[PDB]
Structure 1
């Protein structure tokens, strides 16, 4: 009712000032901003969360992709995958990054083995072969 959300803002602020690291509390406040819409502080708090998780990982990946930020997309996807607390799909945009970079062969073979009837990944590996054959 916009009220309990402000109270949860207060409690997350307290559990963020007391336990400064607070990826979880700060991520609850970031999820509050994402339920609302201030992309700057939302992405910032989610970035604090991921760096210092699929929620912040998809947030960073999709924001970077919608802005065109292949670098941030690859960073977030690769970090999340190699640590994997719950992460499956972002390797797709990792493949797109590696292709836009020979390299995309690893990730396109990965997508091939994870889903055989993959038209998009078949064409992506096709262009990877057309640039690295």
Structure 2
């Protein structure tokens, strides 16, 4: 294990940009036990694509509560389009901490419409539009669609109430 981090340090000193050394160093640190140094190495690699770098920093900032840094990493890791995925969520959750967020949670739903916590964060960012969304979701069994859309209609709703009654009848049967 020591040999592998020596060859990495050599391949850090010589090819000085060398992100794959540095990220590799971070991986070695993860294998090792000093997450403050591994994170620093990952940051250095970032300064110099790598999804494991982006997620180790972004997970560290996420649990430090620093959702602005985690959006920064994950926004750059998305918009460099060089090979990653999850970051989309941490952009949305940052923006939540409203109008700007409305865009990332609507896009998340267009990628997974039965994504519940995403329908929830969407509502919190935000009546007629909600009803339409419910129809789109209900149009594609699902009680909590029928319940949220109906509630939105009530806020704006007789049809929604009827739908709720039908759902109750179904539950009874």
Give TM-score, length-normalised by structure 1: 0.90
Q: Which has the larger radius of gyration?
A: 2
Give me the CA root mean square deviation.
1.1
Superimposed CA distance per residue, residues 21-77 of structure 1 (whole angstroms, 9 cap, x where no aligned partner): 111011111100011221211111101112322111101111101111112100000
Q: Aligned residues, how many?
A: 125
Q: 2:120 aligns with which of 123, 128, 131?
A: 123
For structure 2, which runs of at least 5 residues remain unmatched after alignment?
A: 127-173
1:93-104 alignment runs, 5 A limit: 93-100=90-97, 102-104=99-101
Shift >6 Å, 4+ stretches: none
Give TM-score, length-normalised by structure 2: 0.70
Q: Deviation of residue 101 (structure 1)? A: 6.5
